[PDB]
A paper describes a structure:
This analysis indicates that the lever arm extends toward the pointed end of actin nearly parallel to the actin axis, thus differing from the orientation of the rigor myosin V lever by ∼30°. Thus, our cryo-EM data indicate that the architecture of the converter and the SH3 domain in myosin X are specifically suited to extend the power stroke when entering rigor, compared with structures of myosin V and other myosins. We modelled the myosin X powerstroke by fitting the actin-binding components of the pre-powerstroke structure (upper and lower 50 kDa subdomains) into our rigor cryo-EM map. Comparison of the resulting pre-powerstroke and rigor conformations of the lever arm indicated a net swing of ∼120°. This magnitude is substantially greater than is inferred from our X-ray and cryo-EM4041 models of the myosin V stroke (70°).
Class X myosin has been found to be localized at the tips of filopodia, which are plasma membrane protrusions containing bundled actin that are necessary for cellular processes such as cell adhesion, migration, angiogenesis and the formation of cell–cell contacts. Myosin X is required for filopodia formation and extension.
Residue numbers in the entry:
A (entry chain D), B (entry chain C), C (entry chain B): 5 to 107, 118 to 178, 198 to 280, 306 to 371
D (entry chain A): 3 to 63, 66 to 107, 118 to 178, 198 to 421, 430 to 588, 607 to 671, 674 to 738
Amino acid sequence: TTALVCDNGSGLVKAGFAGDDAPRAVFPSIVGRPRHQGVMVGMGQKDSYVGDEAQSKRGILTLKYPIECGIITNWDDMEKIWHHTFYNELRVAPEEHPTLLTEKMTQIMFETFNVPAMYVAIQAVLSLYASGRTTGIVLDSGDGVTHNVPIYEGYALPHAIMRLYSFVTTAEREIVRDIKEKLCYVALDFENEMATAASSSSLEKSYELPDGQVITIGNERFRCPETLFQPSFIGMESAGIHETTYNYPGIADRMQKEITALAPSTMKIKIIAPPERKYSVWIGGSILASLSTFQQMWITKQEYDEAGPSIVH
Amino acid sequence: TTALVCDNGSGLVKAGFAGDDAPRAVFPSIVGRPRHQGVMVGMGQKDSYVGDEAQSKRGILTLKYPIECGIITNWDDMEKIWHHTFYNELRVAPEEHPTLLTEKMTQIMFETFNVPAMYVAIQAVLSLYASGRTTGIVLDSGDGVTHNVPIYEGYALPHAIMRLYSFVTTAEREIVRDIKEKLCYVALDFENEMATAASSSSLEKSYELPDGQVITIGNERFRCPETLFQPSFIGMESAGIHETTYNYPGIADRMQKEITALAPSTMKIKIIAPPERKYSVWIGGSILASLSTFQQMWITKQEYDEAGPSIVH
Amino acid sequence: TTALVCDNGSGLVKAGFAGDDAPRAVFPSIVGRPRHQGVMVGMGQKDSYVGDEAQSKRGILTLKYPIECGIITNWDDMEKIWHHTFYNELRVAPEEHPTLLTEKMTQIMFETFNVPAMYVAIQAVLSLYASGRTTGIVLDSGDGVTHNVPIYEGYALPHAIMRLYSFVTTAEREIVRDIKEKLCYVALDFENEMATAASSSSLEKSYELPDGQVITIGNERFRCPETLFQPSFIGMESAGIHETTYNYPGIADRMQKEITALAPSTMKIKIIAPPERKYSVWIGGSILASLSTFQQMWITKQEYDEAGPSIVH
Amino acid sequence: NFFTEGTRVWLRENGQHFPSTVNSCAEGIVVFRTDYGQVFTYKQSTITHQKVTAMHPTNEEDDMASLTELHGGSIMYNLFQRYKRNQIYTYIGSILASVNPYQMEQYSRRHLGELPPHIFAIANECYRCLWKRHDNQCILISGESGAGKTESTKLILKFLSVISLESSPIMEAFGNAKTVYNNNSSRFGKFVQLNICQKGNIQGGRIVDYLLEKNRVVRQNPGERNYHIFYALLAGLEHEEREEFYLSTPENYHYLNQSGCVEDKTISDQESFREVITAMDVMQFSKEEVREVSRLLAGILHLGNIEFITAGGAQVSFKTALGRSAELLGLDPTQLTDALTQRSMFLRGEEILTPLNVQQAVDSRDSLAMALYACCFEWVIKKINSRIIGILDIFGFENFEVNHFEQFNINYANEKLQEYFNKHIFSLEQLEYSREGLVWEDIDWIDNGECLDLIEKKLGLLALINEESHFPQATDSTLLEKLHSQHANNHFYVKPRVAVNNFGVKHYAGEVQYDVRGILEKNRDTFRDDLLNLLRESRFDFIYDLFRRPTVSSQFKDSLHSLMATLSSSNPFFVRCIKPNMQKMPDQFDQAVVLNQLRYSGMLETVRIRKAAVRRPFQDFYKRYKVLMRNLALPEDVRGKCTSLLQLYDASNSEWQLGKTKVFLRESLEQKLEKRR
């Protein structure tokens, strides 16, 4: 009878009931069809692996992200994400609860899965419910859309938000992401750090790759993330997060020293960011649907026969 | 030997001699440096394109407007606008004339370009000299500062004036402006029009974009300009032009119906606005400096040896 | 006293002085050691034949390409290519000129051959200097690395480039290449052509092989090159040049019909490709080093004792 | 600065000193009447202390350098009086100035200076120095055509023949053209080496030619014609030959009509034909070779009519222009039409034919026409030389209102010639100061190497032009900007404020403004090898008898360097011919025209350099500055009297010196003394 807070990011989709800890189930949110012909009976082979098995069996697939830079590409794959998740994972009935989503979806999920109600809260706002503050500008950046939403107590300003070795094959790209994980750090004073970076003393740590290969990356190890500020390297004109805020083990005192140079003087700038942050948004959602009283700001079954496609906003 | 009336707006800078028609030369008034490194010899490539070429070769530049919301940002770009214009365009000597400007400028232009005199008339006042009326409240709104100056015959009240698809790249923003041009119209009764806008009948016209893309905007096509009244949509508290007056193929009967509701009763309100209005201000200026006799309300060189930076007002 | 433009490909290395026609000398760029024991006095036999004689005396060798998919394998063979070329062919002194290369090399050739300067221009950019255009996307594909570089006038977008019968013996493989030469053509509509290909009407031409044997290939004759698009046949997922551009007597109107289906509508697409294209790159270099004035963007020796291995970029 | 009625003065007005007389001086007003008829009125208070310079021992009647006040007005006045009311000469140091006007034993054996100036005096000095120095001589006769250069050449040669022309019509036909400013202007430098045996007797001559204006063959500006020979050919050929070569009137040819020349009269063109034909007969050109010359010229004319269709690349689609060209040259129509539209390359070892675009085809066609003409021109010179102290007939600076590539090249050539002249004079000066005057050190002042560098050095004007020409998207506009980007921060190089005239070069004689338009196309000159091979394959024997990116500007540079090598290996003697009036009037001296001519021939700047400087005979100095000696205890001798005053001004004896007959003093000291007087 519980209610389920389920956040779709370009993640790493997260799902777990109305509280109280973290998602019961987490997986990389990919479907991948087999780029080859299969010949081992059964028919045995699946038509397409969704996560997580599609993250266990790379190389025999062509990974295709169902969503990409915020807007999803097609609901044919997305719906399969959903059906697979609800039916063969969490062991939850479709009529179990009224649901909570973050940001064709609402409707397809409504007619197929028949969750008798609905409500969609924006992904940025929930990030405040983590440490339970009421004020602040939230910089929420995940693959593949970041946002900067400023909220005062308790209303929220809408218009002040600005939204910004050969590794050819798609599957292998996953490994790249992993080398991004462990072997990374943002410098504090880049331009001056590069000079001494050239010194023989290794600021390079050597990671080992799933096959035999041993890959030794240096210099660029701290260069790549630095792209987050100064995104000329990419060839995009929109200035760095540095400037978009005002307007990794590196941050926040990188972010700090950067802002204080651009920020007006005589102003104190705490840059509080928790540990455990990866589930922050979700710890938000849990608090919400369990909390009184916004249950009556939902859209149920009776109220979707009148207006339908509208009213969602 | 002619005299030149040259108006700097956030335009569309306009230039043409002391009468009698319209500016000889008009261009979008931008400098944009090339965001990339060049390798086609000569050195060939310019350090920065001014208009108009900086509007023909977008995308390879970062357009930077030399003026912005009235006050200009820096005279480093501005002076270059000027020098480029006088020397390599109009083919006019610097000592040719005493000049006429609308609103560091006066001074820099005085030492660099040495126009032996000067006079600056306010931009609103000039707009009356078009149809050659002597009375009226002038609503002059251009990118990016509007003003409302009431003038009686013939003195002018000083204190009664109140002054108010992903498209990320700087260059590409220009394209937005063009879709602002053709595909626009202000409704007469917005709130009631919005309901019927939802009806399938297309109040949408499909414009085609410089590359291949075909873009179909509707609804919002008339919503966006409507922002001019009711500027809550922006998140700004200052009330709409509607109210600031009393206090696009849409206007003026939009403006009309709206004012008549706020205005007192039994009052006849012609809302006469010419065609050709884009050059109105300029057709003003031409008439002025050519006219007797205010030539002797100028500030020449001998009288800039005494006071200098003052006396301009 | 001349200067020399020398382009290293996985060719077919090309060499010829600063203009004005085509490389003075062209040869297959291979070293091959004799896989057997020699016993005919002198001792006579060379330790290893470089081209071109190593392309005249196949079958008694094991051909080893000094470069392979862009990165060269080892400079031990490459240097031997170089020394052999400069000394016993062109009959040119090492101190004759400052040289120009396309892409350990720079340094080894610098200490051995002591060319008093240096400059390296990228292989793609030069391909524009052939017919002397200033704009365009260049699709340069030679064995064994292709590239897709978009350049505007005149700066160049850096980040928008994406880079992709028993015949067992190595030597014999050369013969295959020749059957690739004459007996080849890219279809226009593969799928519909394949059906009629099965028809008895010979779309097969019979080539004769250096020994006695006469080999008659058809069908696959047009199938094999088609691999350039649709490169699933190899078992690589990265999509065809077809799609990488947007993102043989067949081309370019194959490329055309393919693109117009993928390209947006109402866009005119010239696919201009010269005759003589095989030397396009070289006709570039000649034009370059002969032209004023980028001579002063070189790196001479005095400027190589300071920084050395760096500064090259 | 007050001067009484009737006083002879120089009045510096509008930027030029006027020979004048004080007409009246009353009520604080002064009126001056110039010798040219102008009346100038001023308030006496405004007449500053020189400003108005009095006519220092006037000499109202052989060498201009003997003038004390050595400036424009003085040169103009002195040349004028000698020409109009005195025997014409005249020397300007080593330079012989010769003024055109109305249509030997005594000079032979005499020294340069003992005789009145005359072309013979120069010829004698050249003959003299030839034997004495055992060294080749050059007599460089500069000035625009018509100024009297051919008369100077004629008499120099007549002289050398005694003491020891038939080709003219030929060379004028192929080397001369009507420009906006001259009906018969030589667009090339002609050097006639008069050969002498071991006993200094004339044995023959050898013509060398340089600086041919190739651009003219295919392009003429408004009111200008191609080389005279084309018009001469069309006006002079008999009906039968005219029909044989498919020739009609000049209006029908792109290479002759594009300018918009009114002309109307063939008549002179027809006379020039008779003259050329006669000269070619004298020169031992066979009837057959002459007809071959005309067949080749006719071929060039028809070639230029060839039109290209932009099929995409291009193709020839016309029954004629090309048919006639192929017929005249005797080459296959299809083989020629193919190569006119395509470029050939051979690669290990197969031919790769690539299509040309229409613009490239036109450029290639023009380059071919220019190549054929240049080689025909050289063939004709070979023939003249076969039949027959170098006399160089060269143009001076050429400045019209609108200056292009043609004038730029001419003025470039003049910068090079002027450098040789300056170095020569500076050398003669050192030698005169050594043997002529005692002195410890000598310094040379006026190097025009910088101007020459701006023009011909890497990143120079011509180099950048070559650069811009080999870029597929290059244009006159981008080349203009490269000039500004490279030079506006340096040189002798200026830009017009309103981008109307385009770039300006401070040349030796004056600033010249060049319009960039046309520079690129005129400079292009890449002939296609396959087109030439086709021509090489056909025969009426004359055609084949013509045996990266080549540009006209670079070829001009090379020819100019070849010319300077030829000249530098000799001892040069200078004659400047000026045209005194524009109407061929007998002894008529138009001051406006003369001033322009003198400047164009470098005379006025050469004078300014010589003027850089003051000297007066001892008594003249003493009589002028006697007022300044009133308070001095003076010696009985005039040299001592001069010393007494000068010692007060400079005791070191460094700003003044006493010579054999004169007091020498620096301009600064003279200015000091004068102000005080």
